[PDB]
RNA sequence: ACGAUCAGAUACCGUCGUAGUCCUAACUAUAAACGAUGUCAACCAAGGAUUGGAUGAAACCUUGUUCAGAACUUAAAGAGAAAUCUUGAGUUUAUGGACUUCAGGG
RNA sequence: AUUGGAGGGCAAGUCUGGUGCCAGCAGCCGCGGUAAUUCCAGCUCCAAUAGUGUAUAUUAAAGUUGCUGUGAUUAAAACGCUCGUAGUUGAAUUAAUUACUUUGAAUAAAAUAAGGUGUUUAAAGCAAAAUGAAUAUUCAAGCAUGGGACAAUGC
RNA sequence: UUGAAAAAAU
């Protein structure tokens, strides 16, 4: 966007927010129930 | 090619043939030196260009290159003993400082001039060209003997010349 | 430090300010106003951080009073809505700004012809929204402005920008009397230790 | 984007950080192939030259890789 | 489709630079990526940069200084002779005093300063304003 | 005589005497006569005269546009347009406009730091219309190798060794000083490998005597 | 005898980069140093904005960046957004 | 082919009417076949809304995130000769991401 | 000491006789239908000068042939669209050739750049008052060698 | 309802 942010250290809501292949370091949304 | 004898070409015209300011600024020098045509103006020009374009082309390179210790040192020695370029400068980059007013003054009829021989520029033509003037051992009728920093205490006149 | 203990907020300066609904924003969320906002009201409006507001509007001051304390007519306050001139006016007075009441008549900063041509270093405007000609003056002048901003107004050309209700009518009268204050408090005109004689409802509409 | 088709789908999964056959399902091109009764269905024979060519290109991939015998060659 | 990551990882540094930002991402980290950065970290045009894993050539984040005027890639990397230096930098560099090339050669990954005096020649990989 | 602005005082009563100082903290000319005090003896040339028509209901309303470029030859110049029904109004119209829109002309070393000032520092461009000018640092002893409308420019900038290339419609011979201008007018706003430092701290000439032009 | 560069070009603190001479949207803030009784002092920090960033509405949240590092201001700007 | 209108009307206007307009089989391969804008890839300001899924709240509808598609609005910014373009016609004399086709005054 | 010219390009006449869209000039724009700065001529000066115009052609101008380096919505110019062979281009990663890169070997002279040398200067010549330039090469290939980052060849 | 045309250079 406009107002940068820190893309090293990235937010928790930040990364809970963003497509799971585009969060900093991708992970599974899925779990083993 | 012809001819084996080698030869060459010593003034080019300029590329726009009309400009106002380029007739003053030549006049300025013409009579300053009371040359007779324009062609000395690039004969001196043409000389100018061709030794800085050696010194350009060998400041492009680094100082311990050998070429620049062979012929950057070759180029101030002629330079220097021509009397051109005064003795305490010694670098490449003063060889492109080099104007065309250091060339024409170093033309016969400007160092008889210096002399005490003839009152005005254009009276040194006939002294030199009637062979009154003798450089040394040599008698000469050649206005454009660019003299060397050896023989600048040694232009005096002739002995009766006939 | 540069922000010591004294210019903490007191209760009774957030009393009167939550009194105002001065942390009630407008609707729509404009992309440079997402940090002053703390929160979304029940029908989607904006809550503006009460803290936040008064570290802008006491670095606001600051600026001002650095400024207005040498050469008090170098501070020129334009007031765009039609009700927002008396605090406009009641700032002119107690502080010795220059300020403009109504209609900002274009090439004011410009004209150096013109007869009524100030040539201010700081430009304070009472909503951005409707003060956007006075704004838009100073990128040929290079000076600096400060702004009553809201919710939804653009921040372009404003350098200082302070969270507060511009829409509303105890609000606009609270802020200006706000800033009218620390900005004597700052010039030791008026020392923090005391309560100032004017009261808010003198800047009311 | 796509091989033959302008979309960009980009569903992947996601493989988490710790570690702790297409040939034969592409001939698709036998099921199409249906073209004998609808003769006039232009669309079927336009899908039918795009997996045909699908075909061309993986076999083209299997023989360098030693996976298929130099000789193969699909017909139908 | 991503024929060179060199191209994709500059062209976004020049974005970001001229954008004012701060800090900017590449996604595919090389190692011609990473050695090219420490030329420009070098001569001090940016303050640093890390590299994260993602087991996938994970991405890198650099942080900028208001220094990078412009950082451009080379289409195909020609092979460049110790005397056709001259020619390169008197193209792709505004002055003499002020521009770097980026050349790679068996010594590394070097510029076209610290080439003369190592003395070898190499394909130009790009340049730095 | 008699300033009406703040910047006009301080330049009347003798309080800024380095027409750069003004170029640092971006303080706009807005009275010709400022320019007129700090820079005397300014050169002078007419570019050219051109004549622009407006067809009228009657008639076509010609009018003379003059473009007139003033500096000096240590590193200041500027270029200024006006039009106007009469020959002489034109020249001098367009003298004030010239006046008021100086800026430094950024100049550097080629080789070496043997002495004095005598190309650009850097390669710049000029964003006029069609017309592109390119301003490429030459060694000392090449003049000014460009056409004879921005090399007229060029002098009054002081630079001496300069290699000029173009491309667009040159045959405007207003858009073509434009460009030159253009070119050199952002050689200072390119931030060159020696510019990093930022140096000291220097008050503004309108801060630090404010108080004088108060009373 | 003469200096070569006419004058040494400001910085903006925004982007750090250089000043035009002609750019007439860049401004200059100055906020003075306060004392321990909250009276403002003659020193005071010099602040440069470019005129590009101002007009994007980024000059503002810049400022808070600088101010708050500074230490001008405390809690506008949170962690994750300093850099 | 008639009847008007007209200086004439072999046209526009009105009436009738062959091929054609429809389907099948085989040809034809051209359109202002246009977004007058080649295909693939990276970066890129702000905002409302929409088509189809996924994911929370709310017991087809309102609301948050995200993915893909057709689009729209603002710009003091970038480009351009300008009109205008912005999910590019931007990142280009500070000229080089890959490939193909096309143009050289009328 | 002549040629060309004296409207603009482009330096040079707000001089005088006729002609009256006729003769004519004019490389392009153009000047001439009765008060021609251009025609035919009289006076004067502008450029060059033992040189000076024309006609044709190569080169620069020309970023109007594009590697450096162009243009394709509207000026000329994206195939109606998709598939597709040859060709071109091809993600990250590893602590036997070839290409690339660096040095050499050897390689006719003359010619280009020149090292020196008063053919009195200069073009020239390698001569003179013992020196021959180490003279630098030589595009594209071939041989040897230091290096293996970027590259191609299948294990 | 009908309304066609205006020689060349200045």
Redesign the pocket.
């Known amino acids: ?3 940068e942010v820190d893309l090293l250290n990235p937010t928790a809501a930040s990364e809970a ?3 799971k292949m ?1 969060r900093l370091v991708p992970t599974p949304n899925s779990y083993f129930l | 090619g012809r001819c ?5 070409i ?1 003034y080019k015209t300029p590329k ?5 300011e380029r ?1 003053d600024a ?1 006049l300025k020098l013409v009579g300053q030196f009371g040359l ?4 000395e103006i690039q004969r001196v020009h043409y000389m100018l260009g ?1 030794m800085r ?2 010194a350009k082309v060998m400041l492009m390179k680094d100082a311990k290159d050998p ?1 620049r210790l ?2 950057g040192a ?2 101030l ?2 330079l220097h003993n021509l009397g051109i370029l005064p003795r305490d400068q010694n670098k490449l980059e003063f060889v492109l400082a080099l104007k065309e007013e250091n060339l024409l003054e170093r033309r016969l009829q400007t160092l008889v001039y210096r002399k005490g021989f003839a009152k005005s520029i254009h009276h040194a033509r006939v002294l030199i060209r009637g062979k009154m003037i003798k ?2 051992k ?5 206005p ?5 920093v050896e ?1 600048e205490p040694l232009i005096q006149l002739a002995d009766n010349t006939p | 430090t540069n922000f010591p203990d004294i210019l903490k907020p007191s209760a009774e300066d957030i009393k009167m300010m939550v009194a105002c609904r001065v942390h009630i924003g407008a609707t ?1 969320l ?2 440079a106003m997402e940090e002053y906002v703390y929160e979304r009201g029940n029908n989607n409006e904006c809550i503006f951080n009460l803290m936040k507001t008064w570290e802008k509007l006491s670095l606001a001051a600051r600026v001002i009073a650095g400024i207005s304390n040498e050469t008090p007519s170098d501070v020129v306050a334009v007031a765009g809505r039609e009700m927002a001139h008396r605090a406009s006016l009641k700032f002119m007075k107690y502080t010795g700004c220059t300020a403009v009441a109504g209609r900002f008549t274009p090439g004011s900063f410009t004209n150096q012809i013109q007869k009524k041509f100030m040539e201010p270093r700081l430009i304070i405007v009472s909503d951005p929204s409707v003060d ?1 000609q006075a ?2 003056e100073s ?1 040929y002048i290079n000076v600096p402005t400060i702004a009553f901003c809201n919710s939804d107004n ?1 921040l ?2 404003v350098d200082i920008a302070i969270p507060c209700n511009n829409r509303s009518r105890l609000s606009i009268g609270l802020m200006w009397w706000m800033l009218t204050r620390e900005i004597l408090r700052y010039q030791g005109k008026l020392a923090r230790d005391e309560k100032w004689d004017v009261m808010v409802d003198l800047f009311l509409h | ?1 796509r ?2 088709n ?6 992947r999964r996601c493989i988490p950080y710790r570690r702790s056959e297409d040939l034969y399902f592409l001939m698709r091109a036998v099921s199409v192939r249906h073209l004998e009764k609808n ?2 269905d232009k669309d079927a024979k336009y899908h039918l ?2 997996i045909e ?2 075909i061309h ?1 993986l076999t ?1 991939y299997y023989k360098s890789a ?1 996976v298929l015998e130099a000789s193969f060659k699909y017909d139908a | ?5 060199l ?2 990882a500059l ?2 540094i ?3 630079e ?2 004012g930002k701060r800090q900017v991402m590449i ?6 990526i ?1 050695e090219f950065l420490n030329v420009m970290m070098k001569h001090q045009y940016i303050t640093d940069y890390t590299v994260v894993d993602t087991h996938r ?1 994970g991405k890198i984040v650099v942080n900028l200084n208001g220094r990078l ?2 950082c ?6 020609f ?5 056709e230096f001259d020619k390169w930098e008197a ?2 560099l ?1 002055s003499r005093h002020f521009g770097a090339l980026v050349l ?6 070097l510029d076209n300063t610290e080439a003369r005096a190592k ?5 130009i990989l790009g340049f730095f ?1 | 005589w008699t300033p009406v602005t703040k910047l006009g005082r301080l330049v009347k009563d003798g309080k800024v005497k380095s027409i750069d100082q003004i170029f640092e903290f971006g303080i706009k000319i807005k009275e010709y006569q400022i320019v007129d005090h700090l820079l005397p003896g300014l050169k002078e040339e007419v570019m050219t005269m051109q004549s622009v028509q407006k067809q009228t209901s009657a008639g076509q309303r010609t009018r003379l546009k003059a473009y007139v470029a003033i500096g000096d030859h240590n590193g200041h110049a500027g270029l200024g347009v006006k039009c106007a029904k009469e020959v002489a109004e034109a020249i001098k119209g367009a003298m004030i406009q010239a006046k008021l829109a100086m800026v430094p002309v950024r100049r550097g070393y080629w080789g070496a730091t043997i002495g004095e000032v005598h190309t650009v520092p850097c ?3 000029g ?1 006029c ?2 017309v ?1 000018v ?1 301003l490429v640092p030459a060694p000392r002893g090449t003049g000014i190798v460009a056409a004879p409308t921005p090399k007229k420019f060029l002098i009054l900038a002081g630079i001496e060794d300069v290699f000029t ?4 419609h040159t045959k405007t011979l207003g858009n073509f000083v434009k460009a030159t201008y253009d070119a050199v007018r952002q050689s200072y706003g ?1 931030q060159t490998k020696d510019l990093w430092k930022v140096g000291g701290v220097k008050q503004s000439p309108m801060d630090k005597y404010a108080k004088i032009l108060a009373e | 005898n003469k200096k070569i560069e006419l004058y040494i070009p400001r910085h903006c603190s925004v982007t750090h980069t250089l000043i035009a001479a002609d750019d007439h949207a860049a401004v200059q803030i100055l906020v003075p140093h306060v004392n321990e009784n909250g009276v403002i002092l003659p020193e005071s920090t010099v602040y440069t904005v470019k005129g ?1 960033v101002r ?3 980024i000059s503002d949240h810049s400022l808070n960046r600088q101010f708050q590092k500074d230490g001008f201001l405390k809690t506008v700007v949170p962690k994750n957004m300093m850099i």
Do not use: W
């Open positions: 966007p406009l107002i927010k963003a497509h585009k | 084996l004898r080698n030869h060459s010593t726009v043939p009309y400009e106002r007739f030549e007779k045509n324009k062609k061709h374009t050696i070429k062979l012929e070759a180029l020695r002629r450089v040394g040599q008698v000469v009728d050649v454009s003997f660019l003299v060397r023989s | 729509n404009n992309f956007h704004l838009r990128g653009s372009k050309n | 984007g091989m033959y302008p979309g960009r789908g980009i569903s003769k006039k030259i795009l060519s699908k290109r083209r030693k | 489709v991503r024929v060179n990551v191209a994709d062209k976004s020049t974005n970001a001229k954008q996604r595919p980290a090389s190692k011609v990473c050539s005027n412009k451009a890639v080379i289409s195909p990397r092979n460049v002779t110790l005397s193209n792709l505004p790679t050669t068996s010594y590394g990954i003395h070898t020649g190499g394909r304003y | 390669k710049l461009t964003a219309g069609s592109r390119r290339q173009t491309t667009g390119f | 590009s007009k994007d509405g």
